[PDB]
Design a binder for this molecule. Structure first.
Ligand SMILES: CC(C)=CCC/C(C)=C/CC/C(C)=C/CC/C(C)=C/COP(=O)(O)OP(=O)(O)O
Ligand SMILES: [Mg+2]
Ligand SMILES: [Mg+2]
Length: 354
């Protein structure tokens, strides 16, 4: 049982009307390769509710194009559950770096034939890259590859902490978590689904970079909150301390406080990030191009949609897939903005408030 203190997110959420079609097709898609999925793994993929996640990001998008983003979520939720922090401990970091660079190369060069030493991941990734190239501009395809590099470099960072069972300092986690959560790689598909390139001049501008990092960090921190109970449910089944790779545990260790106080501090931070995102959005929207306005629309649906999906998906409530209701997370809504709109004392992210 986890009670999340009141979150400030005055943004509307909507679901895509074709979740069932998207679910049917993404299951049939992933079953078409050679991943040798067990019924347990197929059940857990259902619990991930990838159509509900990305459908909440792009609830007005055409179903056949949204399928591309949903299918990416399907295979990368699997990649995470099987190829991240798994396998023998000996040579684990080398194994990950090798697989990661093949995935990136296939996104750049779908016929690179980076072979199969018992490989399963690259065939679906190649299918995604080929499908994306039918719709994406070359710049959009570049953005996907680079966003995967940022995610994968962050995973190598995370795996170092997991192997040491160490807890990152808040200043380090605060800018890294957007990358370990694959925020940019997740959202890079959206402008391809939209079918229009966001101008580089806009995406690279400091105000849009701030908005991007604000949105992905908030969503990742919200994930730390709605996946916190699943973390405690894992630490209780393995009898170990909870992982330090989480905002709650980081604030607990950093403030020498108890779990309720840390949950409050984590939500307080999420609320200030959310308020800053909304405030900065208002200053950016007047001069935004139509593709940038669309991008900001997706980030605005991401924040409340991610929360709703995370609080209800069986991924965080029935973790192993055979324990209905093992974890229950509740959350409140704070209807008032944070009283403190100043930058937090976190130098690695303070420039979002510039
Ligand atoms: C930052 C993003 C946009 C939202 C929150 C992060 C998650 C929900 C995005 C899922 C999309 C895709 C599968 C991303 C790849 C990495 C993925 C495994 C992140 C999930 O967060 P973790 O903390 O690593 O795992 P748990 O949430 O299950 O604990
Ligand atoms: Mg995980
Ligand atoms: Mg998590």
């Amino acid at each position: 049982s986890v009670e999340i203190p009141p979150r400030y997110c005055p943004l509307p959420t909507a679901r895509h009307p074709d979740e069932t079609v998207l679910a049917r097709r993404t299951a049939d898609w992933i079953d078409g390769f050679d991943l040798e999925l067990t019924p347990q793994q197929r059940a857990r993929m259902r619990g991930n509710d990838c159509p509900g996640f990305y459908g909440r990001i792009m609830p007005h998008s055409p179903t056949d194009r949204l399928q591309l983003a949903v299918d990416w979520c399907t295979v990368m939720f699997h990649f995470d559950d099987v190829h991240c922090d798994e396998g023998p401990a000996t040579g684990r970091a080398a194994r990950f770096a090798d697989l990661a660079t093949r995935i990136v190369r296939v996104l750049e060069a779908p016929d690179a034939r980076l072979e199969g030493p018992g490989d399963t991941m690259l065939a679906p990734v190649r299918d995604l890259a080929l499908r994306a190239r039918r719709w994406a501009t070359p710049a959009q395809m570049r953005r996907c590859a680079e966003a995967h590099r940022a995610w994968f470099l962050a995973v190598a960072w995370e795996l170092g902490h997991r192997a040491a069972r160490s807890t990152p300092a808040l200043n380090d986690y605060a800018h890294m978590r957007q990358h370990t959560a694959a925020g940019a790689a997740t959202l890079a598909w959206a402008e391809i689904v939209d079918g229009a390139e966001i101008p580089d001049r806009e995406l690279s501008s400091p105000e849009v970079r701030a908005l991007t990092e604000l949105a992905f960090t908030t969503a990742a921190f919200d994930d730390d909150l709605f996946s916190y109970g699943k973390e405690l449910w894992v630490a209780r089944a393995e009898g170990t301390a909870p992982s330090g790779l989480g905002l709650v545990e980081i604030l607990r260790r950093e403030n020498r406080c108890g779990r309720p106080e840390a949950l409050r501090a984590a939500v307080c931070l999420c609320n200030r990030l959310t308020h800053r995102f909304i405030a900065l959005r208002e200053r950016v929207l007047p001069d935004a191009s139509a593709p940038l306005r669309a991008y900001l629309d997706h980030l605005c649906h991401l924040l409340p949609g991610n929360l709703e999906w995370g609080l209800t998906a069986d991924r965080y409530r029935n973790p192993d897939g055979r324990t209905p209701g093992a974890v229950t997370t509740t959350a409140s809504r704070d209807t008032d903005p944070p009283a403190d709109t100043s930058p937090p004392a976190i130098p690695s992210i303070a420039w979002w408030w510039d």
